[PDB]
Design a protein around this ligand. Structure first.
Ligand SMILES: [Mg+2]
Lengths: 270, 266, 116, 87, 203, 223, 244
């Protein structure tokens, strides 16, 4: 699907000739085939649109999950680029000592947006997070914490396609980064359950709590424009970096982000 | 095992007792599974697996808390030689010294056990009882947790008059013959009084020295060290440090008992 | 942050203070201080204050990482249908409630006393 | 502040440990009634329920319902709590 | 040497202080190091201190000043409430940020003043928290109104659209009984080390 | 007053090194330094042990040959004989070294080179050949030319082996072997350790005795 | 400090792996490295706490009810679950499944065959868990067995932390109702910690994490891996962890 990566020669920074394939080319194939098996239609269309159509539905759930999985990976890979560091095939794999190493995210900073233009994006990040280093710590640490199949998302709060404020969120297995598609499904289910019970307070209080959790400061609902995705699953990093080198992998990813794409994704501010 | 267990019917679920048994079985086989936990202190392990006098270090003593003496304001200056320095408003007991005295004490404990002497472990503080009883069991010895009635040795005939005496082999077999009433009424004096709180039972120490019995004591930084034959400088207040010293002593006495049994067998 | 003072074998340990995170030891101010001392010894930072600052900065990152770990673990649990019967804040509220009930009955009695 | 250390005493004890109980309900009711009768003339029906309550309280006996181990602790803990120098 | 071991060891690690255990004044942060036991060690009265601690204490946590005093008793108080306040704060998940335009102190002779927060929160402000129901915009927390509102081990300033008479005026000075929900807006931290929260009453 | 050894303690002389020493340095009635050197050269076994053997051969080469030969001659005789006689013999050989008539022990010059002049650099040596047995005897024996005598003690006693060493040190391999033989006329390692660490009253609290016994068992006996 | 336990015939395992299901490298990835890593993490979490003394299973049981300190629970759960999985795998320490076990299965699954049950389990594994997880065959206080999937570090033992289905994706009405019922049951417990009673025991744990299969089987073929595991597992161990 993507241009920047290929089957013969992967990125010099992150992945290796075999490890890249295991991470990306095979996974994508598995997902697409699965999606085809689920749905008789072979038309790809947009993935996001399909998700929106089939969300809040247990029967049309698997397909949605597979769309999310495909989309998220693609989003992650678009952001990535080459790097200065040596390939993991040359380097030795990290042992149990990697756990005890102090992280340098607090003290050091590298590969900022400023170095390749992207000034307004950097300013927006700073406004959101206090600084670049703080943002980085938020991102990488969050990704480490996920511990399983998941994705860390840099997002923008959609209220032209205007935005209010940048944010970051984690999402797991095949969770979407878009709030509007899944906002209030649980509340609806609760309401249905209450209706069923009636047919056959605390519940009212719980509903009220749910409502106040959901609803924003003004608008009827809220949505998030994704700017950056970073995968957290063993699928990618176990091949090259082993068990102990998740943090190292994340560092490498961070070094090799193409910030121009992220900047382009970022819409105009209010 | 479990002869009175009424097992539930196959169509029915588990009974309460049956369920408990299943849980026990799980615990024995597969609960302690995922990992093993090396280098960690279990309190019970000092009573049931104390180290030999040889293998004790200064580090182990420090971990036990033996180094922590009474207080700067509760200082008997008689004990000055034993103390290392002061810190946190507390005198700290020189622990190399403690070690050497402990070894000396341990050796004398072993010796009397080997000779087949009556060792008596005296420990009036609250938590000390169970460990004291264990120590007494380990060597074929004796203990006192409930208070020491003044005059057990000095006034033995009045106090310890109506309790059963026994006979013993070169081994420790009762050889149950009838003791004569003259044979029974004589005092049976200990050959080692070993106390865990000498400051709390001065009295016991005083008859020991009157009754001509060598004695061992955990001398804290407020206790008089001249009041018994073999003082061990250390922290008598904390329960675990006392147990550690006591457990060591028991182990030393146990060894000597084993040696005696071996030489009897020979 | 609660501190266990009951020592495990002091002889058994073997900490290289090249880094803060030792295995048997937890992360705390002590670990920082040990790191500072190590730095002083090695003369990476000749000044004591600078070494202390460095150790503090090492600690902070680790603490932040720890904080993030727990939150994300909680999030994961929430996502995958885990159920926590009593949350910490809920527990606290419950604890307060009993005390308040005790106070109220007493307070009413005291007011009655005062009236008469 | 100025600490005050006592000398060695024979026995630390309070001669009358107060076990400050709550005041009697019947007495309170009687006082309330008295207060009411200070106002509102001699016997107006504003204090109609109060009198009834008092009567109910003081039916079996004039009062309704009929010690602190403090000098069992002092005696116990004197020897500890002393700053008495060693023997 | 022994001296070195002593300096390393867990009693030396507890930084000494003679602050009151009973302080009836304003408490903005922890005074004393909380000290826990394990259950096993509690069972045989051992806390890793100079002496045994009374069998009357059944709580695993405590606070102390002196290992041993002239009165022949360790000066302690069996309570570790400060950890629970911190844990409540963490649960609430409202990240502390300096309202004054300043860099975060954790990033980059001696200053005794509090470096940023005192370490109740090492959380960073930029994150969102998703759930089954969705992305939580407003943090819902139950608290009690005093007259100010007690919200999960912290007192907090409160604001509302209209002052509700039915709940307030029915029980004027027994408002502490009824727990109300709150929407916590933000948490600032002043120079004295007080956490100045700001909540909003929900009905 | 003893203390246990640290947990990072390792006994310098490994098993394979001890084995190679045993192989090489054990000699017959008429053994020599040359014979030892030959043995070292032709030893075969572990690679590390072979390297060790080579190293010790090198350091023997570096040192003086005549002195080594003299030492070799002395040691068997001293093992055979009693203390006082051995001491006398040692005194005689020291005297001979001091006043070398035959001029076959370059000692004083070597001492000057080392102790007096400079710490660095070994002595080149000016005498390297196999001395005869009669010559060796003459070197380590008295004559009527010079009178020789030790100064009289209060306790003028003579014995073949030490009266009080064997009790108050770690027990020799030989003693362990003898014990094993006695036991035979089943046996196991733990039982042996118990016997040595508990039964023997002089050696109950010996510091590194169990470890030593274990090492001995590893080296010699089999399952 | 928590350290990995010594497996029987460890050197042989290192040389080979496991005859049928896992390679030398693949076994190292799942156990000799990953398990160690997990143990280290658990130690780091619970170094100075009271949790240091307890075993992983007992830690998990302690922690389960607490919403915070979920990381500890996750780690402890993983450690225990992974060692159960390894125990199931191991060749020795040929064995057939027990007669009693077969009878219990028959009672549970409407008188179906063991092959059928296996097939149902693999289908469940395929469908239920996305990403990582665990696949247990458990037994509860009602003597019949049942199949239990968990989504990453969900324990089979304690039902509020079964972690049995993903609410990140959309869910059914029936599933929601079940969740609501569970929540109600939890609320009914009435203790200060707020922890229900539960007597679920695992009989056949299987590791649906990528640390087991991904090296050998690739990103696909997790089902195939699961099938292989089911075919070749230590039956004596299973039999031992079955009877009351
Ligand atoms: Mg004392």
């Amino acid at each position: 699907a993507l241009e920047h990566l290929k089957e013969g020669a992967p990125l010099k920074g992150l992945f290796s000739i075999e490890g890249l394939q295991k991470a990306w080319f095979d996974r994508v194939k598995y997902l697409d085939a699965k999606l085809n098996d689920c749905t008789n239609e072979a038309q790809q269309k947009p993935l996001e649109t399909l998700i929106h159509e089939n969300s809040k539905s247990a029967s049309k759930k698997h397909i949605v999950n597979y769309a999310s999985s495909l989309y998220n990976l693609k989003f992650s890979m678009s952001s990535l680029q080459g790097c200065i560091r040596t390939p993991p095939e040359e380097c030795p794999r990290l042992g149990p000592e990697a756990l005890l190493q102090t992280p340098d995210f607090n003290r050091t900073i590298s590969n900022e947006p400023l170095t390749t233009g992207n000034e307004r994006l950097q300013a927006a990040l700073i406004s959101s997070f206090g600084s670049l280093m703080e943002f980085r710590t938020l991102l990488i640490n969050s990704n480490l914490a996920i511990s399983g199949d998941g994705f860390t998302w840099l997002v923008a709060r959609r209220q032209d396609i205007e935005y209010d404020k940048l944010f970051i969120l984690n999402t797991y297995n095949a969770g979407t980064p878009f709030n509007f598609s899944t906002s209030g499904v649980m509340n609806e289910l609760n309401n249905q359950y209450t209706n069923m019970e009636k047919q056959r307070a605390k519940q009212a209080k719980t509903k009220f709590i749910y409502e106040t959790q959901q609803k924003g400061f003004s608008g009827k609902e809220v949505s998030y424009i994704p700017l950056l995705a970073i995968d957290a699953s063993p699928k990618t990093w176990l091949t090259d970096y082993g068990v102990f080198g998740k943090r190292e992998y994340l560092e490498r990813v961070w070094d090799s982000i193409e910030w121009k794409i992220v900047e382009s994704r970022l819409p105009q501010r209010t | 095992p479990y002869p009175n267990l009424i097992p539930s019917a196959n169509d029915k679920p588990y009974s309460s007792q049956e369920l408990f048994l299943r849980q026990l079985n799980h615990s024995m086989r597969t609960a302690k599974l995922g990992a093993t936990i090396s280098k960690v202190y279990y309190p019970h392990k000092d009573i049931f697996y104390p180290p030999l006098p040889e293998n004790i270090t200064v580090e182990s003593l420090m971990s036990a808390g033996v180094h922590l003496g009474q207080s700067t304001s509760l200082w008997r200056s008689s004990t000055q030689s034993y103390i290392y320095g002061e810190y946190k408003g507390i005198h700290i007991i020189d622990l190399n010294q403690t070690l050497s005295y402990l070894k000396r004490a341990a050796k004398v404990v072993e010796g009397v056990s080997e000779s087949g002497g009556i060792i008596l472990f005296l420990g009036t503080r609250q938590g000390q009882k169970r460990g004291l009883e264990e120590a007494a069991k380990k060597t074929h010895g004796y203990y006192v947790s409930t208070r020491w009635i003044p005059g057990t040795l000095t006034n033995s005939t009045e106090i310890s008059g109506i309790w059963e005496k026994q006979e013993i082999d070169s081994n420790d077999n009762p050889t149950e013959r009838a003791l004569s009433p003259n044979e029974t009424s004589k005092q049976v004096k200990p050959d080692l009084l070993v106390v865990l709180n000498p400051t709390e039972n001065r009295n016991a120490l005083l008859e020991a020295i009157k009754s001509r019995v060598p004695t061992i004591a955990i001398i804290d930084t407020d206790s008089e060290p001249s009041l018994v034959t073999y003082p061990i400088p250390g922290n008598d207040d904390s329960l675990r440090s006392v147990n550690f010293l006591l457990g060591v002593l028991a182990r030393a006495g146990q060894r000597g008992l084993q040696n005696r049994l071996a030489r009897n067998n020979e | 942050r609660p501190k266990i003072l009951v020592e495990n074998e002091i002889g058994d340990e073997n900490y290289d203070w090249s880094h803060m995170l030792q295995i048997g030891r937890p992360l705390d101010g002590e670990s920082v201080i040990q790191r500072t001392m190590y730095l002083i010894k090695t003369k990476q930072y000749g000044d004591m204050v600078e070494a202390y600052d460095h150790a503090r900065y090492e600690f902070y990152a680790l603490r932040m990482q720890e904080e993030t770990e727990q939150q994300v673990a909680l999030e994961e649990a929430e996502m995958f249908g885990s159920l926590f019967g009593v949350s910490a804040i809920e527990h606290g509220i419950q604890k307060e409630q009993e005390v308040l009930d005790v106070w109220e009955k007493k307070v009413v009695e005291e007011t009655e006393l005062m009236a008469a | 502040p100025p600490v005050y250390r006592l000398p060695p005493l024979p026995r630390l004890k309070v001669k009358k440990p107060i076990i400050r109980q709550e005041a009697n309900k019947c007495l309170v009711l009687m006082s309330n009634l008295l207060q009411c009768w200070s106002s509102y003339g001699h016997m107006s029906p504003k204090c109609a329920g109060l009198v009834t309550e008092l009567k109910s309280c003081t039916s079996e006996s004039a009062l309704g319902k009929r010690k602190s181990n403090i000098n069992y602790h002092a005696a116990r803990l004197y020897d500890r709590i002393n700053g008495k120098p060693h023997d | 040497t022994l001296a070195e071991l002593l300096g390393r060891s867990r009693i030396a690690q507890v930084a000494n202080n003679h602050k009151p255990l009973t302080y009836t004044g304003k408490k903005f942060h922890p005074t004393h190091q909380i000290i826990e036991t394990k259950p096993s060690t509690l069972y045989r009265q051992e806390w890793g201190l100079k002496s045994a601690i009374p069998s009357k204490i059944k709580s695993r946590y405590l606070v102390y000043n002196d290992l041993d005093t002239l009165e022949r008793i360790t000066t302690f108080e069996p309570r570790g409430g400060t950890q629970w306040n911190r844990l409540r704060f963490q649960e609430m998940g409202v990240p502390i940020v300096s309202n004054i335009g300043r860099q975060n102190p954790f990033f980059k002779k001696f200053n005794t003043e509090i470096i940023g927060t005192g370490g109740l929160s090492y959380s960073l402000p930029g994150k969102l928290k998703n759930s089954p129901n969705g992305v939580i915009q407003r943090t819902v927390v139950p608290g009690r109104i005093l007259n100010l509102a007690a919200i999960g081990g912290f007192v907090a300033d409160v604001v509302f659209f209209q002052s509700p008479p039915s709940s307030f005026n029915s029980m004027g000075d027994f408002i502490r009984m009824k727990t109300f929900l709150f929407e916590i807006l933000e948490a600032s931290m002043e120079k004295n080390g007080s956490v100045s929260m700001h909540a909003r009453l929900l009905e | 007053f003893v203390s246990p050894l640290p947990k990072d303690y390792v006994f310098k002389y490994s098993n394979e090194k001890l084995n190679v020493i045993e192989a090489c340095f054990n000699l017959s009635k008429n053994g020599t330094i040359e014979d030892i050197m030959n043995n070292l050269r032709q030893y075969e076994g572990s690679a590390e042990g072979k390297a060790f053997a080579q190293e010790i051969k090198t350091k023997l080469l570096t040192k003086s040959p005549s002195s080594l030969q003299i030492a070799l001659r002395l040691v068997q005789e001293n093992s055979r004989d009693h203390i006082e006689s051995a001491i006398k013999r040692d005194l005689y050989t020291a005297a001979n070294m001091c006043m070398n008539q035959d001029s076959l022990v370059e000692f004083s010059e070597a001492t000057k080179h080392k102790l007096i002049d400079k710490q660095r650099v070994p002595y080149p040596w000016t005498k390297k050949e196999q001395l005869f047995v009669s010559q060796l005897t003459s070197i380590t024996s008295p004559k009527p030319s010079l009178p020789m005598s030790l100064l009289r003690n209060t306790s003028n006693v003579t014995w073949t082996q030490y009266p009080y060493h064997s009790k108050y040190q770690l027990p020799t391999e030989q003693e362990i072997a003898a014990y094993i033989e006695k036991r035979t006329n089943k046996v196991t390692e733990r039982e042996v350790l118990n016997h040595f660490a508990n039964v023997i009253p002089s050696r109950r609290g010996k510091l590194g005795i169990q470890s030593l016994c274990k090492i001995v068992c590893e080296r010699k006996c089999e399952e | 400090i928590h350290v990995v336990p010594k497996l029987p015939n460890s050197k042989a395992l290192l040389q080979n792996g496991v005859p049928n299901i896992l390679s030398s490298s693949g076994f190292k990835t799942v156990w000799f490295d990953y398990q160690r890593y997990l143990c280290d993490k658990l130690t780091l979490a619970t170094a100075g706490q009271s949790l240091e003394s307890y075993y992983p299973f007992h830690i998990l049981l302690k922690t389960a009810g607490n919403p915070l300190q979920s990381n500890i629970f996750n780690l402890a759960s993983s450690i225990h679950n992974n060692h159960l999985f390894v125990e199931n795998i191991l060749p020795s320490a040929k064995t057939e499944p027990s007669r009693l076990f077969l009878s219990k299965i028959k009672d549970s699954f409407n008188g179906s065959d063991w092959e059928v049950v296996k097939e149902e389990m693999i289908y469940r594994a395929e469908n239920e868990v996305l990403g990582q997880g665990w696949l247990f065959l458990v037994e509860n206080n009602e003597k019949k067995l049942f199949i239990l999937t968990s989504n990453n570090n969900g324990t089979p033992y304690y039902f509020p932390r079964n972690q049995s289905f993903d609410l990140n994706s959309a869910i059914s009405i029936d599933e929601f109702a079940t969740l609501k019922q569970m929540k109600e049951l939890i609320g009914k417990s009435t203790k200060l910690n707020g922890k229900v009673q539960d007597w679920t025991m695992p009989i056949i744990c299987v590791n649906l994490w990528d640390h087991a299969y991904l090296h050998d089987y690739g990103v696909g073929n997790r089902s195939k891996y699961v099938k292989n595991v089911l075919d070749n597992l230590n039956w004596s161990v299973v039999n031992n962890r079955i009877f009351s």
